[PDB]
Structures are given as structure tokens and as C-alpha cells.
């Protein structure tokens with residue numbers, strides 16, 4: 148649709164030359180992913196987020212350019228309150244930038260870790276974010292898209308903490324197909340996604356890991372933790388050596404045992420090791436509505 152084509156130099160100006168100091172300290176850097184660093188800027192009185200694309204994981208310059216074109220294509224087709232909105236881009240010279248509507252509360256990953264001293268999210272807000280994120284995935288699946296990169300760093304939060312799915316560079320139009328290029332964040336990936344399969348069933352699995360991060364406040368992976376992988380707590384609970392109560396985030400005072408167990412039951416189902424036994428996104432969405 149109408150995306151503004153900026154010149155790279157204009158984005159160089161709005162981000163104070165992609166100032167690498169964190170925004171918490173007066174710089175412009177907000178964070179980063181496998182495909183680039185994201186910065187704050189102001190364009191014509193509008194606060195914006197600017198991604199300066201870079202192959203920060205093991206992908207080629209040509210693959211990074213295809214991911215750029217793909218994100219624009221997905222954004223032109225998909226608009227929904229639980230999806231990030233693209234405003235523009237720059238593709239002049241050898242640089243690639245994406246310009247988005249700014250998300251005042253950053254990522255769900257950072258809000259769960261209370262990065263930069265932000266207050267812990269209440270259980271009530273955590274439930275609305277889970278619902279919002281499921282509505283976003285539902286919209287994408289309804290519209291024949293597989294996200295392929297679902298994780299709490301890719302769930303953003305606006306001024307009212309409305310969940311906004313981000314990063315559509317790996318998204319694929321959707322019969323299970325295979326790929327030779329296995330790309331993603333291991334800690335969130337379904338076993339079949341780790342084998343190169345492409346299916347919306349893998350989006351559900353990754354959403355299952357997100358639901359565990361919401362309940363526990365723990366990251367999906369921590370090398371200095373036992374177990375290193377959060378998804379492993381499902382087996383510990385099933386083997387009855389632990390309960391979800393032993394893992395619930397202690398940085399909340401409004402979590403009731405009934406809705407916590409209802410969210411865990413949704414997470415446990417999304418995390419079924421066999422893709423065909425997982426619920427589809429419409430079922431995930433109904434269960435999270437019944438929970439509240």
C-alpha cells in the first residue's frame with residue numbers, strides 16, 4: 148500500500164546517525180534482532196522505529212534483500228491492530244531500512260525481564276497480551292501466512308500494552324513443504340521446523356514457548372540455568388517432579404491459580420511434540436478467551 152520511500156540520508160538524520168547508545172541513556176538504539184539493529188527517531192513530529200537491516204545471523208546479502216522485499220509485501224497485504232504497521236523504507240545505495248509506527252512499551256521479552264527498570268507486568272495485563280498475540284497469529288493464518296519467527300522479542304507493546312506481532316521477513320504464503328535454509332531462534336523452534344519443514348503448526352509451538360515465558364517471566368534459553376531450555380519445564384511438570392506453581396513469576400500479586408493453570412494447559416497443548424496433535428490458532432484463541 149502507501150509506504151513512503153525515504154532516502155537513506157533522511158533516516159541517517161532522524162536516528163542521529165544510527166546513534167548506538169541506548170535510548171535509556173539519551174541515544175537512539177532500542178534493540179536488535181538477527182536481521183538488524185532498531186533505532187528511535189522523529190520524522191515530521193512522528194516518533195518512529197527504524198530498522199537498519201544487516202545479516203547479524205548466518206544469512207547472505209541476497210537473502211537479506213529477499214527478506215526486506217518479503218516484509219514489505221506482507222505489510223502491504225496484512226493490517227490488523229495486533230500486527231506492527233510499516234510506514235516506509237529506504238533502498239537507495241547499498242543500505243536497506245524499514246520504518247515502523249513506534250511501540251512505546253518495546254518488546255514483551257524486555258517487559259518480562261523488566262529491562263531498564265520498567266515495572267513487572269500484572270497477571271491481568273499478561274492475559275490480555277496473550278489474547279492479543281493469538282489474535283495477531285489468527286489474522287496471519289486466516290490470511291494464508293506462516294510467520295516462522297514467533298518469539299517474545301517479536302511481540303511488541305504499544306502505549307496501552309496492546310500486543311503487536313513484528314518481523315515478517317521470513318513469513319511464507321501457505322500441504323507441509325520443506326526448505327534447505329533452516330533459519331530461526333532455536334529456543335522457540337518446533338522439532339519439525341528444526342528439520343526444515345514449513346507449516347503454520349510450528350507457529351503454534353513457538354507461541355507455546357511464549358506462553359511459558361509469560362507465566363514464569365523466565366527467558367526461553369539461559370545457558371547458566373537448569374534446565375537451559377524453558378520448553379523442558381513441560382516434561383518436568385508431566386513427570387510430576389514439578390508444578391506450574393514452582394515456576395510462576397513471583398513479580399506479580401494478582402495471579403489466581405485457576406487462570407494460571409488454564410494458560411499453562413494452553414501452553415502444554417501448543418507444545419505437543421507431534422505437530423498434528425497441537426491445537427490450531429482458532430482453538431488457541433477460544434481457550435485464551437475462556438480463561439478470562
Ligand SMILES: Cn1c(N2CCOCC2)nc2cc(N3CCC(CO)CC3)c(NC(=O)c3cnn4cccnc34)cc21
Pocket residue numbers: 170171177178179180185195196198231247248249250251252253254257262263265300301303313314
Ligand atoms: C520504546 N521502546 C523501548 N523502551 C525502553 C524501555 O522502556 C520502555 C520503552 N524499548 C524498545 C525496544 C524496541 N524493539 C527494539 C528491537 C527489538 C528486536 O526486533 C524489539 C523491540 C522498540 N521497537 C519499536 O518501537 C518497533 C516498532 N516496530 N518494530 C518492528 C521491529 C522491531 N521494533 C519495532 C521500541 C522500544
Ligand SMILES: [Ca+2]
Pocket residue numbers: 192
Ligand atoms: Ca510543525
